[PDB]
Amino acid sequence: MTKAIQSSVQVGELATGQALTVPIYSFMGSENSAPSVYIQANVHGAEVQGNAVIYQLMTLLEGYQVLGDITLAPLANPLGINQKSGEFTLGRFDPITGVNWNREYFDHNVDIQNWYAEHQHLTNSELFCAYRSMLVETCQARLTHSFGISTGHRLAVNLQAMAHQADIVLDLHTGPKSCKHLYCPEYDIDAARFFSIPYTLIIPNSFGGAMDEATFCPWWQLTEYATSQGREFSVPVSAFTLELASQERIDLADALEDAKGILAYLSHRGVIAEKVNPASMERFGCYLKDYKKFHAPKAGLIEYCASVGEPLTAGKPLVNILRIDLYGSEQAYQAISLPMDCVPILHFASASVLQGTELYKVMTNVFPLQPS
Amino acid sequence: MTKAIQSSVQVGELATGQALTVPIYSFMGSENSAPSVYIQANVHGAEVQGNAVIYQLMTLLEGYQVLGDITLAPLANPLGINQKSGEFTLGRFDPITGVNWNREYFDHNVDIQNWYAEHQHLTNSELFCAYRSMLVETCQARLTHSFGISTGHRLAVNLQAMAHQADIVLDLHTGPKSCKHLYCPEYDIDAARFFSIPYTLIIPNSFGGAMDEATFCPWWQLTEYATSQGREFSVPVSAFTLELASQERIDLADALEDAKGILAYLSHRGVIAEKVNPASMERFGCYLKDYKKFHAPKAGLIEYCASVGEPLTAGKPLVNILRIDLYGSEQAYQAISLPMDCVPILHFASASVLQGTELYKVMTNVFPLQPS
Amino acid sequence: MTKAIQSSVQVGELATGQALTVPIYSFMGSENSAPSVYIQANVHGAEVQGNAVIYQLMTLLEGYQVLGDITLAPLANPLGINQKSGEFTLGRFDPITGVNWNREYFDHNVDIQNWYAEHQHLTNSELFCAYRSMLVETCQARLTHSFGISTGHRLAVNLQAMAHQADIVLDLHTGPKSCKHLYCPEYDIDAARFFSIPYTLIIPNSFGGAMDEATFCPWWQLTEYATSQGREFSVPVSAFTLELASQERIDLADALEDAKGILAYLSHRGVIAEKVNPASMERFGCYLKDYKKFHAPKAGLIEYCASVGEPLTAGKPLVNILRIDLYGSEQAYQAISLPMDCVPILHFASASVLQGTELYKVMTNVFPLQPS
Amino acid sequence: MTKAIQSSVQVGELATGQALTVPIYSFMGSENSAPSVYIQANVHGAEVQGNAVIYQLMTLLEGYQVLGDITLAPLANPLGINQKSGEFTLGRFDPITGVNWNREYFDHNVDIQNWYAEHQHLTNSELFCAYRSMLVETCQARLTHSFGISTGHRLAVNLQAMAHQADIVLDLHTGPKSCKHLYCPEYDIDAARFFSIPYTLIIPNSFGGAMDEATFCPWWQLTEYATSQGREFSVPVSAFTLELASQERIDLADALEDAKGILAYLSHRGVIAEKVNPASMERFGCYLKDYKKFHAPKAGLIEYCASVGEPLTAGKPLVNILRIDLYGSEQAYQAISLPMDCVPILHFASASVLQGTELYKVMTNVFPLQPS
Ligand SMILES: [Zn+2]
Ligand SMILES: [Zn+2]
Ligand SMILES: [Zn+2]
Ligand SMILES: [Zn+2]
């Protein structure tokens, strides 16, 4: 007997007339007081582990008292999830245009001086309520532009309209071959210690088309502006992108670990009644500017020597490149290392690369979040 | 006995060790006085007609006296050109990342006040020479960043390094199912009447990652800045993107028409000794902001009623949508029209679409370039 | 007020849980006497014109008296129809395995001597009824094998189970860039003159995995066997594959022409009450063994000189190959012709090919079907 | 100072004019007495581990005395190896037609009664020499058919022409997510104990388009026929397909293990002078008919519970299927097991499947090869 109310939302339509739909599960909060939450997975279609996280999270929630509304949208991009090419989900971008599904969210470009002038007389709570209504409506308005909008923009807008309703937004992703990491805005670095995530990227106030930024930027802007008029309060919305290890993988046991960390955060925020403690583990971070993409310096076949999630001392091998077309030479086999210490986070999912193919992303200038 | 000197440039490398190379043909100019030209085709791999244009152009050039250097780079993106998916060239974007090959060019972000202060003492010709050396070197420098650059950025940079050497840059493209059209910066609208192209889009001074913008923007910036210090001269470089009808098509007769229009422009610019007159035809334009993408308002099977390159009076059908899944209803067949007059330029190459698929691009607020 | 009863059939299931369904329209026959018909389109997902044919056919049928059941299955392969790669439907084969959807039908391998021995005592009509029940059941049985069957086999089997119920089966396809042609078994060449199709391929009694063969072979086998026991009757089932010009195209006017030819055949067979005459046009055929694939003798860019559907005298150019990488040589441009007269039927949809890419299929040893 | 002589063979040509080439390394044998060997890898382009095996094998061979010629063809399908789709090598089939590269080899259809009658007077050694010349020439003849042959047939034929020259043919492949296994014809089961491969599939005398069958079938046919004329000798050629664990992976240490097992076999056959012993390990086999494909009984997200290469007792879980679209039901999570004991060999590389997607291949009726 689940507590969840199940519905569905139409996000697009296929040529055969079949609706593209996303299933929505809602755990109603018992206190109108409590912060609400919107959790989605699998916008990048290969990144399926978020669905297992939602499954474990909802299973746990059957036994916790939910104070604030929790809305979960697994399988949030059916077009991408269902897109196969060989034995692999071509789920990252529109197969027609190449546009990354996670770069399709809407930037409101709010005239903040003006909007604030028209609503400054409201209390902090009323001001936040008006501002949220505006973010929802202007988002919904994109759906009825007379020359239309792209398939990817329609998907993104429908998801964003729901995300805007929530106080807390969690966008669940995976990397390729990847360890667990988190994208966390600067203003909310405090929150990083509640998730069960060893590595956090601290991101600035900047819109680059992603769900987390679409969700927090307008609120960050409003707050910095209000502070410049001597009206201090903390950013009313929190948004995070979780990167739950590797794509093309479902692991229920690992998903339960991730779900418990999420519950630790929801507990701390008063979304649930129970105290759920964060896991004990070493947690580190770096600023986004220090997170670097290493591109193949030449083409070849690749052995990935450096383990994801483990420190790599400068000079230790990151990859070996095999060039069997050059046997007889020193060029046939080459160890490649980096000139600084790093923590490699993820690497490319195939063992054959071109010159310029992304091999790894690595964090540099890493530090403990919670030094102890 | 061709006058062309043939060479080749390496633009990347495949996993098997095979070089990605672009063939380069150079017709040496006999006057160090004359403007030089760089012409490339087929960066978008499906857009093969530019190769036929280069072939007809070079055939013609065997009989004209070349005053200024002409460099031609057909087959400029071998990775994209050779990328098949079904009976179709998946040539528009990196198949790994989805990044559009024509959005990969380098924006120099020149500190223009500073650069100009260091070089103002030079004559106009010397200043232009110094500025060109800087554009070439900083472009070449991108090739040796220590974490590397993407496959697409390496391609784009190698092409751009050559384009920067020229006074006149022509990037030859095609649309999908498309009529002939041209992208022309505002400052050079005069040039549009020399090409054999009925429709021209007038573009502003704005960098969006394309070859034409990468080529002209720095020069446009320098000129507007110099004019603000009371030093007036016209923009020293010209760049144009030609859209030579439809992709996945080679038509030598049509390519000869296009080549003759190109020669008309090179003649007018003194690149060749002969007077070659522009073709007689009606020519029109619109500002870029008036060129609009019409997205499918619903999914279905599409009949493209409006001919590309012909005026479409408001209310006349653009497409019919067939929905054979809804037979028995009025929804089974639907004429779709637009609320304003337009000239449809191109449409989508497939007859099955989703909600949001791009159906057409159409020009609005069209006017004669050369009213007579 | 359509006469059609609309239903739907589930042919598979997507990872997100969405059913793959095919819409079914049935015009009930008023005479239990009359032959029944099964018509499907778009098993190859790019081959969308068959849907327009079904639309025109059903529109016409609203005004004809239907004597025998007519079942229509447009949009018969939703997975394939909805599979995009660039601006093109990758609809021909399973994107995971490469298996051609039209090579997935089930060969019953009937022990014909035995089956006939057990049922020889039945009248011709009863024997045909028993045989049809067996073909339907053994087909349906494939759906519940304990290790399962492939995605493509499940699709094919569900379609075939319906096709087996009918006396007349029409599988509607298109070629790539193609003229109208028909695949007709040898025993039913008489039927070819009723369709509005200039070129017919006469196929033997041979199973190669296609819907037409899956449908007619068992009946052809039964008949030849019965004839060897001195029991003469004509093959009780008719099956045809129609190739309705080019893929990625919807043309309602052209579809109406095709629908009228289909009605001419259904009329002649007594499926409808009215006399509908075949169109007046020259009709030709060749045996399948004389229909030939011409492969690119070298790679390059291709201009398709020979028009589909028109005779090509030996020595007249089929294609020109442009090799802009070889400018300066005779190899840069090469006319390719064939050593015998032919009728080119279809050619490759892209203008860039490899060595060995299929360029054309051409009929040789062509003759009038209906010499006059 | 490598002993290998390096050359290259052209196997096709790309639209830009670039040759498709395969690098060939030859270790000359010092005894005209000794059996020769042809070893190729990576015909399926994702299956890159064979290149690492060739690298380790050649490194070892620098220190062994080579008695018989050894020819190695790594990177044997550059078109397939270089074909990317997302972060994955779409290397299994022609991206244009869907035809599996490993189903493209040539079946000679030798009229064996006739050929043998014309050559019976020859000694066994002379007969084998004549027969090999015929297999090479008729293969080469396929390259000059006047309507050409497919891209895939041209590749396959060029490889096969070399394979036919050798006494021993090793085609090196990988599975998807897979343990090490071997395809071994029935007549040569003895050879299986020399490789370092725990599981062997015993295949019959049957041509299905693969390199191993193209190589051994004609010789198997000749031998069975000669035996029917009272002329007994053992099949003069040996061919094996090695499946070296998982695709999209290079592991040099694991490749060295595989190379040592190959050397064990070459030693036993007198291709090298040294005695190299086989590895000590348990080895098992099953007949091909007992090796089974398990297809997804419904669509969903998949957790692969059964480890490849380990026995799975009937009733133990093979996969769990997660259906997050059905949360609240028993259908949300389902353990799937098999009704008989098996050894799962490989599974599907993605975690999202359709109804009918291949989940695993499993061996049944397994037995020790070398019971002890
Ligand atoms: Zn993601
Ligand atoms: Zn383009
Ligand atoms: Zn077809
Ligand atoms: Zn393989």
From TrEMBL, chains A, B, C, D:
Transmembrane segments: none annotated. Zn(2+) binds at H44, E47, H173. One of its GO terms (molecular function) is metal ion binding. Keywords: Hydrolase, Metal-binding, Zinc. Coiled coil: none annotated. Residues 34-268 form the Succinylglutamate desuccinylase/Aspartoacylase catalytic domain. The keyword Zinc applies. Its cofactor is Zn(2+). It comes from the Bacteria. CDD domains: M14_PaAOTO_like. It holds the Pfam family AstE_AspA_cat. PANTHER family: BLL3975 PROTEIN (PTHR37326). This is Succinylglutamate desuccinylase/aspartoacylase. It comes from Shewanella frigidimarina (strain NCIMB 400).
